[PDB]
From Swiss-Prot, chain C:
Region (Disordered): 1-25
Disulphide connectivity of cysteines: C15-C23
Name used for this protein in its record: Spike protein S1
Effect of F25L: Increased resistance to neutralizing antibodies and human covalescent sera neutralization
The protein's assembly and partners: Binds to host ACE2. RBD also interacts with the N-linked glycan on 'Asn-90' of ACE2. Cleavage of S generates a polybasic C-terminal sequence on S1 that binds to host Neuropilin-1 (NRP1) and Neuropilin-2 (NRP2) receptors. Interacts with host integrin alpha-5/beta-1 (ITGA5:ITGB1) and with ACE2 in complex with integrin alpha-5/beta-1 (ITGA5:ITGB1). May interact via cytoplasmic c-terminus with M protein. May interact (via N-terminus) with host bilirubin and biliverdin, thereby preventing antibody binding to the SARS-CoV-2 spike NTD via an allosteric mechanism.
Superkingdom to which the source organism belongs: Viruses
Effect the entry attributes to changing S12N: In strain: 20A.EU2, Iota/B.1.526, Omicron/BA.1, Omicron/BA.2, Omicron/BA.2.12.1, Omicron/BA.2.75, Omicron/BA.4, Omicron/BA.5, Omicron/BQ.1.1, Omicron/XBB.1.5, Omicron/EG.5.1
Organism: Severe acute respiratory syndrome coronavirus 2 (2019-nCoV)
UniProtKB/Swiss-Prot annotation, chain D:
Effect upon mutating N175Q: Increased resistance to neutralizing antibodies
Domain BetaCoV S1-NTD: 1-227
Phenotype when changing V154E: In strain: Omicron/XBB.1.5, Omicron/EG.5.1
Gene name of the encoded protein: S
UniProt-reported outcome of changing A163V: In strain: 20A.EU1
Lineage: Viruses, Riboviria, Orthornavirae, Pisuviricota, Pisoniviricetes
Mutation effect (I151V): In strain: Omicron/BA.2.75
Protein name, as recorded: Spike protein S1
Effect of A41V: In strain: Eta/B.1.525, Omicron/BA.1
Protein's organism: Severe acute respiratory syndrome coronavirus 2
Amino acid sequence: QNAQALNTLVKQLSSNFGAISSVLNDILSRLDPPEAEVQIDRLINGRL
Amino acid sequence: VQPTESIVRFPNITNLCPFGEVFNATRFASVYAWNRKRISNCVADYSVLYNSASFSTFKCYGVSPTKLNDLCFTNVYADSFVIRGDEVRQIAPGQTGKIADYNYKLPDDFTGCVIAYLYRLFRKSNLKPFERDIQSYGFQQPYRVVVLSFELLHAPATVCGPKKSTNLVKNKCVNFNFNGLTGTGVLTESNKKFLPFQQFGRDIADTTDAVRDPQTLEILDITPCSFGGVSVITPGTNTSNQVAVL
Amino acid sequence: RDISTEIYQAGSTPCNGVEGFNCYFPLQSYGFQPTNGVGYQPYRVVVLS
Amino acid sequence: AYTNSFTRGVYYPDKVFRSSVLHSTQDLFLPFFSNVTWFHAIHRFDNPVLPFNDGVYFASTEKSNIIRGWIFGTTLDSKTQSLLIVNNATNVVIKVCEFQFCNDPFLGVEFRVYSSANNCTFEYVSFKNLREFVFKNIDGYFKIYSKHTPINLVRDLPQGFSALEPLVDLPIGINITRFQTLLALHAAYYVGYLQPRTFLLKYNENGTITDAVDCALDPLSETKCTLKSFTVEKGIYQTSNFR
Ligand SMILES: *[C@@H]1O[C@H](CO)[C@@H](O[C@@H]2O[C@H](CO)[C@@H](O)[C@H](O)[C@H]2NC(C)=O)[C@H](O)[C@H]1NC(C)=O
Ligand SMILES: *[C@@H]1O[C@H](CO)[C@@H](O)[C@H](O)[C@H]1NC(C)=O
Ligand SMILES: *[C@@H]1O[C@H](CO)[C@@H](O)[C@H](O)[C@H]1NC(C)=O
Ligand SMILES: *[C@@H]1O[C@H](CO)[C@@H](O)[C@H](O)[C@H]1NC(C)=O
Ligand SMILES: *[C@@H]1O[C@H](CO)[C@@H](O)[C@H](O)[C@H]1NC(C)=O
Ligand SMILES: *[C@@H]1O[C@H](CO)[C@@H](O)[C@H](O)[C@H]1NC(C)=O
Ligand SMILES: *[C@@H]1O[C@H](CO)[C@@H](O)[C@H](O)[C@H]1NC(C)=O
């Protein structure tokens, strides 16, 4: 059970939660701040 | 542990597109019979043309010569024709006159760089952008001008500017960006064996584990830099002020 | 707010205070005329912070 | 005129090395045990233009190398650029051109495949045996996989497992709807179609795909996919869904 829970928590990092990308660097490079900060906010909420 | 040095490595920027076929050739066609040159399947290195000496003008429209090395486009056209010095302004978005409305009309929304001969004096309709609908002018000065029209479509793009696939590149103990791979960690020579078409390795957690050197096709293990919490050991302050950390 | 008129250099060859290849004077004079289009007409803009 | 696929149609879906693991992926693959139409193009000739859909599986067995290539395009007319793959005895001919094909293309061994061309964009030059290929065009990229292995049965595809390896990821950007095989004449092959299905892939210590499981064949396969294992113990399990 402990290993299953840890694996689920680790695998949750790859989701998009509705954002453009699951990598912060791609969001930073592909967009300007006034929307990159919104996408990062979405990702932050999901991981919290 | 913070990264020490960032030796980010990318292979040689090869091959080189034949810019010299137009920018550096010996023959330029007439303005009313201009030749459009199609550029594809090559690395468009604009530094050589931007830094080339003996250029009368170097005019960019919506682009930057230092930036064009980092733009990838599907199709790029190299318009080459002979024009005189006084009418060199006719190759411009929205400019009017004999040459633009009769010989070579540049789009009012043109994007690219213009770097620098028969007069048509009678027309029935103004020429469209990049239109060639075919009075003799005697050169008793001529200016060889090349127009770089950058067109991007939904097709895959073939002319960017940077290295393509297969060149020389190195690796060190770095922070450790190579090619499309990023992130910090220490690199160690690996005994793993990749298939010839395999470039990455991944753990059960879908995390990057090993990477193959693009030049000398060897595989390196990726071990991340150390980290951990810090704790402070102390008796009561009413006994001493000494501490020990772990 | 920067108030300077140094000849900009886009190349590696120093300008030495003159325009030329890769050398530009940063400022361009506004061509304000009564014959200009609406989008090129001068506009008095006030910013309050 | 019908043979069944068995365990054919597995290709490496990426270029990542994974060792001694089990991985689940969702991509276009040839369905298991879905029967494959066996064509005899010429024996009375039928060498028609077949739709491409979302991808096409292809395989054949020949020693004289009668099939020399394939033709791809939307209208198969010079009005729009089309792709032409020709395999010479010396090299490979790949074209992307506004190409005016004929009503019966063939490699006269004359060139009556076409009559003219208007534009040209891309040009590239580089027993009892079965050569197996997978063709797909996604996001304007033409992708081809290959694998060669001997056989002992002619009329039907022998059973077995061996994954196909990536060959070319060509960035052209052509609209595609139909295709037709190109042959040299002075004819036995197969046509399979790809569907979006989920599969389990087994990797050995060398990173070689050695087994697979289709997740929609039967309830046992569903249980195997759910449990992420090739072995299922006694009990009851839930692949729950509804109709
Ligand atoms: C898969 O990995 C195994 C590792 O044990 C390979 O077995 C050895 O392979 C090497 C060459 O790669 C041979 O020199 C050894 O003799 C093999 N071991 C034994 C006990 O014979 C195996 O060859 C690998 N298979 C593939 C297809 O790469
Ligand atoms: C290629 O890279 C090597 C680095 O070893 C360098 O010496 C050489 O000048 C480079 N050549 C080109 C054309 O980039
Ligand atoms: C390109 O320019 C160089 C001078 O740097 C010259 O030697 C060469 O002949 C030119 N190439 C062509 C094709 O004109
Ligand atoms: C420490 O000792 C002093 C007197 O010796 C006392 O006033 C203080 O409250 C003590 N504090 C603690 C944390 O024990
Ligand atoms: C399998 O065979 C049936 C008839 O036996 C046919 O209707 C079906 O289309 C075949 N499946 C294919 C060709 O994928
Ligand atoms: C290619 O097609 C274009 C139309 O998009 C046409 O203008 C051009 O002349 C063609 N190239 C030829 C015929 O060589
Ligand atoms: C052509 O391809 C594009 C995208 O690849 C698609 O949107 C369009 O519907 C296609 N048109 C035809 C006629 O196939």
